[PDB]
Structures are given as C-alpha cells and as structure tokens.
Amino acid sequence: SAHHLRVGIDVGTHSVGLATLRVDDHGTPIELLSALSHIHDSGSAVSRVAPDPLPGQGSFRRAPKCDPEFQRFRIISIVANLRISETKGENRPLTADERRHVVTFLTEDSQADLTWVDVAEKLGVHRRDLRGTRSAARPPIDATDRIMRQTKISSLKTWWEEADSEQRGAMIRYLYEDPTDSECAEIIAELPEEDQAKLDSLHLPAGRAAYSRESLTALSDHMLATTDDLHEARKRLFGVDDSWAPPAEAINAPVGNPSVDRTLKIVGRYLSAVESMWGTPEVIHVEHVRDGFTSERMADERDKANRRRYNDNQEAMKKIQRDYGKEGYISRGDIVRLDALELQGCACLYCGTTIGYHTCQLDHIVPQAGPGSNNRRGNLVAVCERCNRSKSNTPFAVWAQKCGIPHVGVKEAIGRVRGWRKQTPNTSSEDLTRLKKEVIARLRRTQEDPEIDERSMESVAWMANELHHRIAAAYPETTVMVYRGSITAAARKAAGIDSRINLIGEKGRKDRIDRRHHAVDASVVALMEASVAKTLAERSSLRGEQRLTGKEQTWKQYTGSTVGAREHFEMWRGHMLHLTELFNERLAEDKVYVTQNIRLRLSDGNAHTVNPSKLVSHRLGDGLTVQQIDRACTPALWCALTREKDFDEKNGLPAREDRAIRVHGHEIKSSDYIQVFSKRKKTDSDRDETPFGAIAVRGGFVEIGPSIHHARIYRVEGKKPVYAMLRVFTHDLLSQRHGDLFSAVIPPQSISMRCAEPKLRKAITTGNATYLGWVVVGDELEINVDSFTKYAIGRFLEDFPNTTRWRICGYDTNSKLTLKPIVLAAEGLENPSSAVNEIVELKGWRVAINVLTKVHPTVVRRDALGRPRYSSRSNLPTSWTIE
C-alpha cells in the first residue's frame, strides 16, 4: 500500500535523470524510492505506415504530424473546443465565421508568440468571456511552418517563403518519408551543395497522426464550417459512436531522431519498471531540455551561438561603460533604454517628443495582470517622462484613446515604428522585422497580458507536447506535466538547497562535474506543485521588472500574493529540505545509480565502404614467416598454410620449389603468389609485422579495428595464472548471427584468434585456457583502485580518490582495456591536471587485462531501475566477478 508516487524525469541531450518519490497525504517526501542518471550511449518499404483506422479510410496511410494538414487540423480542432460566454450561465461555441477568422489569425505568423488574450481581442470579446482553453495553455501554431521559416538553410527557407500550400505539403512529405513527386528533388538538387549537406540537420515536428491526410482535411474543413468539435465531427462524417477512440503511439515509438528515441526508450522502460515495482504513479513530471535534443551537434551550435550572445552583450555593457561613464552595475534597463533610443531616433514613441539617455524612461506597452510584466524586448519602448506618468498601468491603446495629448495615438505610434531602421553593422533585418511586428501588435492591444499561472512554466516545445501525449495516454490515471528546462535550477535556488547536496565537486561552478546531478534534477521536478510553479514564474517575472528598473531587487521576498500561496511555498521549501536529507542519505548508501545501456546486438552496420588498402604479394616458394602467415588474406589460405607438414609454430614455412597447396579448389604452387595484409610501404619488409584485424574486399583489404562485438576473458592456467582476452570481431559472428553470440565458436583460422595474444592462442588450442565470462563496451567495472599509485591513473586518484566505478570505452590493444570514470563528467573540469584530463577527457585509463584482473574487479550489470543484477530467469546479462 502506497499513498502517493511522484515520478520525475530530467531530459538532457546525452542523459535522462530519473527519480521516483513517495510522499505522505500532505506532500512531505517520506522516501526516495529511486534516483539514477541514465547516460546515452553515443514501393517495397516506407510506407510501412499503419492505415487510417476510421471506417472507409483504411486504404489511406496515416499522415506524419509534420504534415501541414495535420498542423492545420490540430489548430482547428483546438479552436473547435473554444467557447464564448455572452451570458453568465451559458457558453456557446465559436461560430463558423469566428472560427475562420481565428484560424486565419493563428496562421498569419507561425513565429508570433501569442496568448489567449490576443485571440480574445481578435474575436472581440473580453478574455474572461473565452473558455475551452494537454489542454492548450497557449494558442497553437503551425510548428512545421515555424521551423521552415527559422531554418539556417537559406535556399530552402527562401523556396518555402515563395509559396504554396500544395508545394509546401508535397515538400514536407518528400523530406519526411516519401521520395517521389519528381518536382523534388529537382528543387533539392538545384539547391547549393552546402545547404543540401545541411538538410539532414532539419528537424520536422515528430509523431505519426491517428488519421490520414484525407480524414484530417475532411475533419478540418467540417469543423471550420460548423460548430462541431472533433468528437461530433467524427460521428457525423464517419459514423463512429461515442466510445470510438483512436489508439495513441507508445512512449517508445521511434520518431527518427537518435537522442529523442533513446530518451523515449529510457522513459518508457523506466515508467514500466516503476509501475510494476511500486504501483501506478500519481504524478509524472518531466523537465524538458531547452534547447535542445535536436542533436548534439545542433546543441553545440546553440552553445556557440550562446557564446556569441554572451560576448556581444558584454560588449554592450562595455559600450555603456565608456560612453556614459557608468559606474559598477549596468542593468538590462540601461541596455534596453539605449537600444530603444537609437532605434526610435531619440524620440518618444508615444508623442514623438525628443528624449535622451537622461530624460527617457522605459515603459511596458502592455501591462500584465498580477505580479510582474512581460519583459520581452518587443514590449519595451523609450518614452518621455510625461507620457509614461500619464499612461500609468494602462494599455497603450486605451490610454491613447482618451489621453488627449497631441501627437499621441495608435496610428502615430505605428507610423513611428515603421520608420525604424537597422542602425547596426551585420544586424539581421529578420529580427528587426519580427520586433516591429510585435511592437505594432502590442500598440494595438486593449487588454492586459494575462496573469501568470501554473502553466506559465509548462514547455511549449513540440516534442514536449508529444511526450505529454504519449505518457498521459500510457498512464491515464496519472497527471502529467512537462515543464521548461529552467524550472529545476529555479527551484533549487529558491529552496536554497543547491549547496546541501553531497555531490562530487565544489559549490558551485557553472557546469557540474558529478553525473548524479540529473538524478537531483529529476527528484526536484517530481516534487513540483502547481502553486509553486506559479510563484516561481512570478518571481522570475518580477526579477525581470526590477532588472529593467536597475534598482534594488526585492523579488526574492516574493513567495505568493495570497496567504495560501505563501503557505504552499513555505511548505514546499520544507519538502525540498527533506528531499535533500533523503538524497544525501541515499548517496551515502551508494544507491544513486549512473547507468548506461550495453550493446548486445551485432553491428548493422559494416556496410559502409572504405578505400581498400593494397594487399602484399609473396612468392610461396621463397617461404613465409609465422607473422606473414597469420596475416593471410583469407582464413582458408591460413588453413592451407598451417596444414602443411613442414609448418613450424616459430619458423613458419621453409623455402621449397615443390610446394603445392589447395585453397578453395585452386592449386597454389611455389612459383605462385599468396597475398597478406600489410600496413608497410611494400618497399619495406613485413617479415616481423604482427597481425591486425582486417578483411579482404574488392581491390585489397580494410581494417576492422573498432568493429569488435565483445571480449571473452580467459584464464591461462599456471604455474603463474595469466589472464588474457579474446576480442571477437563482429565479422566473425555473422554466420552465427541467429544464435548465442557469446558461445559461438571462434576457429583458429578466424581473424579474431589470429589477432589474439599468442600465449592465449596457444592456451586455447591446447585446452589450457578457461572461459571466465564476457564483456562489452559500455559495461561497468567495479574496481579496487588501492594498488594503483603509479603513472597517470595514480595522479588522477590523488584528485579523485576512491574512484571505483569505471566504464569500458574500447579495447586499446589485444591485451589492454580502455576505461573512463562513470560518475565524472568531462564537461565540469575546471583547470584540471594532465593526468585528470588524460584519464577523463582524452586517452582514458589504459590498463592491461592481467594487471586489471589481478585485483579481481566485478562486471556490473544493471536493470531498468539501475539496480545490480546478480541472477536472471530471463537469461539477461548478469553481474559477475572476474576470478
């Protein structure tokens, strides 16, 4: 019996923090059931898409959500839920005409950021007269269209700007799944090569719709012509009944985006495990990543762009410092006022009078109901003292209607805004155009911005909505929130717990070095309440205001405007404190896990082509050395050479002129030439060159270096017991793909054996090697590192002692494993050593298998919750100690 389970999921670009919390009836955290960081491991085809499940439509393929027709359908169906109250008792739906005007309005600009107050103003009603508003907290947009207009791919964006609906839809369908039309890729091939290269970085809205384009269009057209919502429209158009409902995609249904997809697998599996183990969660909270899990490369692009941002803003602060002799702290208000003055040409936007840096004041065009204001650049203007004093907390249009001040009006103000020009080198006309559009829009506004609520912190990113949809579908008795990525750091600061967590590192650099911080973030998000989300968002808004004034900030004192709000907030701070207690407790138990999936399937995967290296020819009659023989171009050749009666394990094949072997039927004589793999200049000698992983292909050979599936750990029996390993190449398992990979036979003529340690080869051929168990890259080793005080590793342990948990990152040689610390994140190293940087960041800890096994480390295998797995009935990989 469990009262309340709260699950928290902290989405990252390379990780997913996962936490499960138990709280009492009052919300006090009583037990941290789970806390881990899951690190990511970096026509006869399509359509294989499910058909439309609506009756009569089953011959049509379900449309992807990025299809313009789906975006349109989604907007329309959301608008078809909107209601208008003309009388305090009853609420009527929007008429067809109103619906058309609204949908037109919402699709004018996919890039416009609107609230429902905007829609209420378009409709000609008060905001409070508008109902039926995840339930869309904000108005919908054509996400696909916004993406196409924001892409950095010039030519594509241009083409998309240049019309039209049919062409747009066709192109999206082309880019997403269907190569046809023939119009594309002529349009695509016409595009510059650099852009055509960039094309794979384009991330259309993910998801598969429940219906086909045909049905989407039908339902849309219908809902736009009537007062029916989606339910009714389905009944009337298709005949289905009240109970009819389309299935939703599973959480882990692939969307074609690597990081997103592994995130989805992690989330789905975790939630399954949680519900199975402890029961159905009361709450599932998610902190989305903003921004964003489009890629790691695109994320690094956003990071570089953020560098650019930071530096140019810093340059702005410097400019104010040298231009105005500004002393000390330079507010966002000083910066904005200056920018506005330059833009408005030193004139009040409201009345036109001349202003300067001393005389001008900054105003919010539209006031915001309740605490705080909307602090967007587009809601800020430079104003004279008189206009600002007169306007007060009133919207500009309302104020201007009866201010009776000369040259003050919406028309005059918009006229001024249209006159704005760049005034800066290499500044985008795009951003300026957006800015002018926004300003004019707000100049027309006759209603306040809406008060901040519990949804102000909700993420509006497409993938956030899709994730919400999926989890809520999979857990229909559970409330689901997907917040914006800024909420955990806000929460931690506001509760004052950011320095109380016993994580590795010091409080508190920018980036964190302990990978367990994701588990913290998850725990925190699971604890989030509506009232607290509201309060936090308000505190941020206030902070923005006071930052625009430049004066002393008081927002930290704000913990709610009502009594219940402040009660909730204080209570919550108590809960955060308890959660800190629980987390540190669990950290002491070493039960805040750091996990990573291990790869057990064969590489898909080796189909890619490399430039074939030249094979070297040797006259068979001149004899061969063991090294030359071991690099024979085919295993059958190797067999032929080692089968020879005068073959010597040390001296290879002696020179003979009467030699004759048979390789796959063909006869090879002393005067004939056999081929071997070589990485030496052919003008050199390969008599002593040792064998390396390679396969023969058309025109020579290729190296299968990294392409290793697993390593089998053998104990060569002593005397002096000697541990060794066999790196099994993916190539050597293909024939037995459909079987047990870890028990499949690896013959002596295999390239794997031939590339193994000679001692191990000999041990295996003579039944002197004992199979201990297998490992793969990604596997976790628990190691006693007391005996390692020498070299780079020891110097690393001087700074990070008792670092016992390591991950296999590759096989350095045929006898050396490459390890890196699991709990530590390279992205949080502040001026490290050379040893620390070598172990963590660069080469890693490269350690001989014998040396490593001497301390008897343990291969650790973990389940869906991160817990060590020692036995399994499902024949899943279990943990084992290397003895």
**87 to 83, 84, 90, 95, 130: CA distances (angstroms):** 12, 9, 6, 16, 12
Q: Rounded to the nearest whole angstrom, what is the least distance from the CB of residue 385 to Zn ion in the complex?
A: 8
351 binds, among Mn ion, Zn ion, Mg ion, none (CB under 5 to 8 A by kind): Zn ion
Q: Binding-site residues for Zn(2+), please?
A: 348, 351, 384, 387
Q: Rounded to the nearest whole angstrom, what is the least distance from the CB of residue 487 to Mn ion in the complex?
A: 8
Q: For residues 176 and 186, what is the distance between their CA atoms, to the nearest angstrom?
A: 16
712 binds, among Mg ion, Mn ion, Zn ion, none (CB under 5 to 8 A by kind): none
Q: Is 675 in the site for Mg ion (CB under 5 A)?
A: no
**Which of 213/518 has CB closer to Mn ion?**
518
Q: Rounded to the nearest whole angstrom, what is the least distance from the CB of residue 145 to Zn ion in the complex?
A: 38
Query: Are the C-beta atoms of 752 and 746 separated by less than 8 Å?
Result: yes
**Which of 387/783 has CB closer to Zn ion?**
387
Q: Is 732 in the site for Mg ion (CB under 5 A)?
A: no
Residue 388 tokens read as 């600002």
Q: Is the dihedral of CA 407, 413, 416, 422 positive or negative?
A: positive
Question: Which one is catalytic: 285, 364, 575, 709?
Answer: 364
Q: For residues 436 and 419, what is the distance between their CA atoms, to the nearest angstrom?
A: 10
Residues of this chain that bind Mn ion (CB under 5 A): 10, 12, 287, 518, 521
652 binds, among Mg ion, Mn ion, Zn ion, none (CB under 5 to 8 A by kind): none
368 binds, among Mg ion, Zn ion, Mn ion, none (CB under 5 to 8 A by kind): Mg ion
3-state DSSP assignment of residue 242: coil
Residues in a beta bridge with 817: 811, 847
Q: Binding-site residues for Mg(2+), please?
A: 363, 368, 370, 372, 388
Q: Rounded to the nearest whole angstrom, what is the least distance from the CB of residue 135 to Zn ion in the complex?
A: 42
Minimal CA–CA distance to 631: which of 717, 480, 751?
751
Q: Binding-site residues, please?
A: 10, 287, 348, 351, 363, 368, 370, 372, 384, 387-388, 518
Q: Is 466 in the site for Mg ion (CB under 5 A)?
A: no
Q: For residues 538 and 557, what is the distance between their CA atoms, to the nearest angstrom?
A: 12
Q: Rounded to the nearest whole angstrom, what is the least distance from the CB of residue 403 to Zn ion in the complex?
A: 10
350 binds, among Zn ion, Mg ion, Mn ion, none (CB under 5 to 8 A by kind): Zn ion
Q: Rounded to the nearest whole angstrom, what is the least distance from the CB of residue 517 to Mn ion in the complex?
A: 7
Residue 524 tokens read as 């925190």
387 binds, among Mg ion, Mn ion, Zn ion, none (CB under 5 to 8 A by kind): Zn ion
Active site residue 10: yes
Q: What is the size of the binding site for Mg ion (CB under 5 A)?
A: 3
Residues of this chain that bind Zn ion (CB under 5 A): 348, 350-351, 384, 387
Minimal CA–CA distance to 579: which of 35, 31, 33, 34?
31
**Which of 12/372 has CB closer to Mn ion?**
12
Q: Rounded to the nearest whole angstrom, what is the least distance from the CB of residue 560 to Mn ion in the complex?
A: 25
3-state secondary structure string, 544-590?
Answer: HHHHHHCCCCCHHHCCCCCHHHHHHHHHHHHHHHHHHHHHHHHHHCC
DSSP alpha helices (H): ranges in 10-88?
68-79
Residue 705 tokens read as 């270096």
**Which of 270/399 has CB closer to Zn ion?**
399
Q: Binding-site residues for Mn(2+), please?
A: 10, 287, 518
Query: Are the C-beta atoms of 514 and 498 separated by less than 8 Å?
Result: no
Q: Rounded to the nearest whole angstrom, what is the least distance from the CB of residue 369 to Mg ion in the complex?
A: 6
Q: Is 368 in the site for Mg ion (CB under 5 A)?
A: yes
280 binds, among Zn ion, Mn ion, Mg ion, none (CB under 5 to 8 A by kind): none
| Phi, psi dihedrals of residue 822, rounded to the nearest 5° | -75, -50
Kindly state the helix (H) or strand (E) to which residue 64 belongs, with its residue range.
Answer: strand 62-64
Q: What angle do CA 748, 752, 753 make, to 5 degrees?
A: 35
Q: Rounded to the nearest whole angstrom, what is the least distance from the CB of residue 317 to Mn ion in the complex?
A: 28
DSSP alpha helices (H): ranges in 177-229?
183-190, 193-198, 213-225
Active site residue 40: no
Q: Is 541 in the site for Mg ion (CB under 5 A)?
A: no
482 binds, among Zn ion, Mg ion, Mn ion, none (CB under 5 to 8 A by kind): none
- Binding segment for Mg ion among 358-366, 456-464, 736-744, 819-827 (CB under 5 A)? 358-366
Burial class of residue 78 in the structure, from the number of CB atoms within 10 Å of its CB (0-12 exposed, 13-18 middle, 19+ buried): buried
Query: Are the C-beta atoms of 366 and 395 separated by less than 8 Å?
Result: yes
Q: Rounded to the nearest whole angstrom, what is the least distance from the CB of residue 16 to Mn ion in the complex?
A: 8
* Of positions 98, 363, 514, 779, contacts Mg ion by CB under 5 A: 363
Count helices and strands in the chain by DSSP H and E runs? 29, 28
**Which of 467/542 has CB closer to Mg ion?**
542
- Binding segment for Mg ion among 2-10, 148-156, 366-374, 780-788 (CB under 5 A)? 366-374
Subset of residues 377 to 436 that bind Mg ion, contact rule: CB under 5 A:
388
**Which of 121/538 has CB closer to Mg ion?**
538
Q: For residues 522 and 513, what is the distance between their CA atoms, to the nearest angstrom?
A: 17
Q: Give the DSSP letter string of 621-638.
A: GG-B-HHHHHTBSSHHHH
Q: Is 375 in the site for Mg ion (CB under 5 A)?
A: no
Question: Which one is catalytic: 10, 228, 732, 779?
Answer: 10
10 binds, among Mn ion, Zn ion, Mg ion, none (CB under 5 to 8 A by kind): Mn ion
**Which of 448/521 has CB closer to Mn ion?**
521
Residue 204 tokens read as 């259309």
Q: Is the dihedral of CA 747, 749, 754, 758 positive or negative?
A: positive
**Which of 130/548 has CB closer to Mg ion?**
548
Burial class of residue 658 in the structure, from the number of CB atoms within 10 Å of its CB (0-12 exposed, 13-18 middle, 19+ buried): exposed
**Which of 151/541 has CB closer to Mg ion?**
541
Rounded to a whole number of angstroms, the distance between the first and last alpha carbons of the chain is 42
Q: For residues 202 and 187, what is the distance between their CA atoms, to the nearest angstrom?
A: 16
**Which of 405/848 has CB closer to Zn ion?**
405
363 binds, among Mn ion, Zn ion, Mg ion, none (CB under 5 to 8 A by kind): Mg ion
| Largest interatomic CA distance in the chain | 116
3-state secondary structure string, 299-353?
Answer: HHHHHHHHHHHHHHHHHHHHHHHHHHCCCCCCCHHHHHHHHHHHHCCCECCCCCC
3-state DSSP assignment of residue 383: strand
Which residues contact Mg ion by CB under 5 A? 363, 368, 388
Q: Which residues are catalytic?
A: 10, 364
